[PDB]
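Lab meeting, action items carried over

1. Structure of the six-component assembly. Owner: GW. Status: complete.
Input record:
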Amino acid sequence: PIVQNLQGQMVHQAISPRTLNAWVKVVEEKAFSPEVIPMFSALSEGATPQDLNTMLNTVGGHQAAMQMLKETINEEAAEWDRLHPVMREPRGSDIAGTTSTLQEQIGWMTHNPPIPVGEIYKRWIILGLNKIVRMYSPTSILDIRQGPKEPFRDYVDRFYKTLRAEQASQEVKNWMTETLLVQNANPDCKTILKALGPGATLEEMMTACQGV
Amino acid sequence: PIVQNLQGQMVHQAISPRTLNAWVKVVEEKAFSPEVIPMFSALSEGATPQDLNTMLNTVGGHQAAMQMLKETINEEAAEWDRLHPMREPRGSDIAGTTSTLQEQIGWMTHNPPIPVGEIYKRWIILGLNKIVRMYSPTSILDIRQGPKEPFRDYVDRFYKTLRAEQASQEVKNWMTETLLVQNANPDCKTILKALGPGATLEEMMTACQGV
Amino acid sequence: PIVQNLQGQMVHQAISPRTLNAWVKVVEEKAFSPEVIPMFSALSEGATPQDLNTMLNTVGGHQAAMQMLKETINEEAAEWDRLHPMREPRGSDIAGTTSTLQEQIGWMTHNPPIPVGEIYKRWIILGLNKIVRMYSPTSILDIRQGPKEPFRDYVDRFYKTLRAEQASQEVKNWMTETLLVQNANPDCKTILKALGPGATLEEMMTACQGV
Amino acid sequence: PIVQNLQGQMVHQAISPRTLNAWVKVVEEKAFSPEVIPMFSALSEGATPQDLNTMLNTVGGHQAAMQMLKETINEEAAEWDRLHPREPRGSDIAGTTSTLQEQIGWMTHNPPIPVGEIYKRWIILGLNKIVRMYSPTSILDIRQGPKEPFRDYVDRFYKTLRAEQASQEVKNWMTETLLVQNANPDCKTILKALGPGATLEEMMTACQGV
Amino acid sequence: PIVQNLQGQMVHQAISPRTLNAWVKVVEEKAFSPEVIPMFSALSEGATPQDLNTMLNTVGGHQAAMQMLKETINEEAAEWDRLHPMREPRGSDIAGTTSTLQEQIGWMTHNPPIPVGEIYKRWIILGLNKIVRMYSPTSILDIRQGPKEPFRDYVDRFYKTLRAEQASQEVKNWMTETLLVQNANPDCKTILKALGPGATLEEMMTACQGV
Amino acid sequence: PIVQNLQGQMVHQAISPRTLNAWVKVVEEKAFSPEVIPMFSALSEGATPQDLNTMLNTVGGHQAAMQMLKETINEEAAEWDRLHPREPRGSDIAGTTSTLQEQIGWMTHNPPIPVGEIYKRWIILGLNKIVRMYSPTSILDIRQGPKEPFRDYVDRFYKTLRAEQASQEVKNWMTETLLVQNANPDCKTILKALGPGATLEEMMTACQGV
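Predicted assembly:
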């Protein structure tokens, strides 16, 4: 993070050991289930690129994913260097915290109009984690279907946990929640859902399918 | 939360990692048992809408409940826009989706403030109440005392179910007066009906010690 | 709790997540063993009625006890409205149910203060007392020394029961004097009669090390 | 503990939940091993009598000891009321008849009237009696087994000697005399090949692996 | 670390006991898996040479590694004395063995600073790199896919080995492009050949979903 | 430790309960492995003699070692009382005959008399002697098993070498000569094929997978 000292100057605050152990436990145990993007954003709230790189590099397992993340970050950094051609201006490799010192990072993050390289880099990281969370999704939302003896609450849990991993826009996710959840239900249960009419809330749908 | 910085400005304090681990543990272990509403309300005591959204979005399980929560928030956000035609916060601003963190801190620190973190925490608690009612594992009419079950343990099950049911107080009065007696063992029920109608819960449990 | 902000303003401080995790663990592990009341009074030392309600409402188990507690708080609040016909707090205001947190701060920081957090913590401790003396597993008259049981272990059981026992200190004095001897083994009871009627517990246990 | 607010007024700081859980775990697990008194003196360092009473009242188990502790606190409080005929009474120092505001008033007076320190002395005087009673056997009964390592016998001897009540001159006599005389006949022979007053380092070196 | 006191003097603050317990657990659980380098560098962001020596010397296990580390540090310190013939630090001063920590505070806060903590943390990381390479459980050429092993798990094992593999990025490029293909199962290798040579890792893993 | 209050006065900060639990765990679990001395030094970097006495006295086990520790502290304190004829006596540096306010006084005079550092040196001298005694065998006895990995033998060799009292010239001779000569005969054939100047990195590179 960044803090201002008693001397009246901006300075680093090292990312806490408990925060790193929390992040590593999150990544290792939850294996890029979609709640990893919000835990990353929450744990990383003040992070400099030094802190962000510390969070990524301290992950031990999932090195396939951490490579796909690194390859995404490099793709975003290359796109940055295209969109932003040539306190110095940061290259993409500077925002990724690779060719920049921590004092350059704090210099940008506290400039008069700040260049928020920690936020910009945290975007590129979340863009990479999104692709990983999609890749670790057990199936596509069009394939999530209710088993012949599966409770509707458990199918709804599977549906909405898969929908979090979809790269659909919210307009398409809206259509999915409205249409696929009924379309993919178990035919007895599906008959109950259609008997509510198509506009039913999820509370009404799950109320109707209690123990069905 | 919001904190006065050393520059004197009102500034965001990030919701603690230990607070998020506590919250996510609470939700995923206790699975919308009714004590989740007061733990939520405690852990979020200072929360901006960004912090509240962080607490909700960091839950991994129970995505049926978390969607029912989001649909409740959208319903309350619409009712807010019906009630309510710096900038005026509208429903998606209270919910922290269309409002920036500095708009949220703006409203929460104006004079008089618009306490968008409190307003949103109300809409969340409304959604969590609906979930806690839906996740009640069996109805109160199904809570019965087993033939060798201590009355104290049956009462624990009965009142734990009454928390989850969200019934109105006259109906809880009727249930605690009549079902708590009538679902007891035949002998324990014989004791409890001998106490007459006015028995306090202390008196009912006192009478059934060691039955 | 209540704290003074850097602007010199009296303001509420959220009851810490570690304090609530500690309290909820204390209640649900120790099951109203008498040390739950000292832990409650420790963990709630500056608590507002909102903080006290947060501590009670976050308990998930023991909903029989938590109902007897609520039932007691309502009885003490009704007695407060009999005793007591800025706005003056009624019993439901002390209990934090009809009062806002800013009212609670106002009462707790007025001059002279109306210490509604301390008053309400009295009513909670009265309810926990009534619960502790019901979760007590047996009467002090039932605590006896087993034929091969060390006197130190019997004394541990006697005084742990005597904490949960309802009795006033004059009666506790008589119990420590008379029952502690009379319920011992005939061997220990012989040694302890040889000490005469007046012996400290240090002397009694000193005499019964090798018996 | 005691802290000064940003208003400059002296105020209470609540004894931390981790400090109470540490203390209660110490008393419950370690069962008045002598190390309990240094842990008490460490955990209670800034404690007002209300903090000290919280530490004692939360212990839960060992209610024989905790009753002996309050009985000897009352012994000390009665002696205080004899030796010192508003000034605190013994019941005020014990935190029973005094409010937290009175306790802080005394502890921050000029000169400070340190009722938390005075009461912590009475508590440690009571825990001494308890540790001396929960001691499993007399120092004179600690003897070395036929194949027991001298290092483990010394561990047992000095752990017993911590709980032993005697003065340091007596403990000097005990460490000189009994540790040798109660040693295994092999070790006892080695310790007679050493000088009569060898250091414990020398004694343990000479008997290492004997 | 170094922190300025409220009296304005620059002074050392020791690494937290929690930071040490974290480091010692990291080393002794993770046993020079490559994530030890970034945990070391994270837990020592502001460390003086005395802080760094405190981290190294508190490791109990792996005294083979800790000796290889020590004699690497001595090689870098000897090279520093070759490159560099208040007082100017020798290599043994930067290693924190011959210098006082007051000299370390001096050098690290001089203008311009002589950043002996950062220099020494480089020598430590160069030694830990050699140890992570040494403790690597097998060669990258020996990582192959089991007959029913998911490609995702094989790629995890491959890139986890490729972190400890010291080879330059030109050779990592060749290995990721051609060994990862050729060390796969015959079915999975057939899928990866059908992509042609230019596939990114995301494409390779996309293709081998459910192979 | 020593801290300055919000009033700017010099103030004791109590040694943290979590730090004491960490130290107590270190001593009970790791039983004077040589890394106990670095852990001790790290957990006590700001300690007054009262904090240091709290760290020692809260140890439960190993009362043989803790007696050796306190009686070598008495030896160092006696040597200080000879070598330095208020000025603190050795018993004051050891925190026995001095108050906490005297200890802070000496630690904050100009120039300071850093009694917490001087005493921490005497404690480390005693932990040195204890670590050298609790070492389960001498380095001459460390040998490689018939099928033991050279990396595990090296781990055992250097973990033993940490606990040796040997000077660095002797440790250089030992690491050069014994580590080779006590290696398994096939593994020793590899190491001999490296020639005399091999680094430990080279020796392990050669014997990895022997």
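2. GW to write a short summary for the group page. Key points so far: DSSP finds eleven helices and two strands in chain E. The CA atoms of residues 86 and 106 of chain E lie 8 Å apart.
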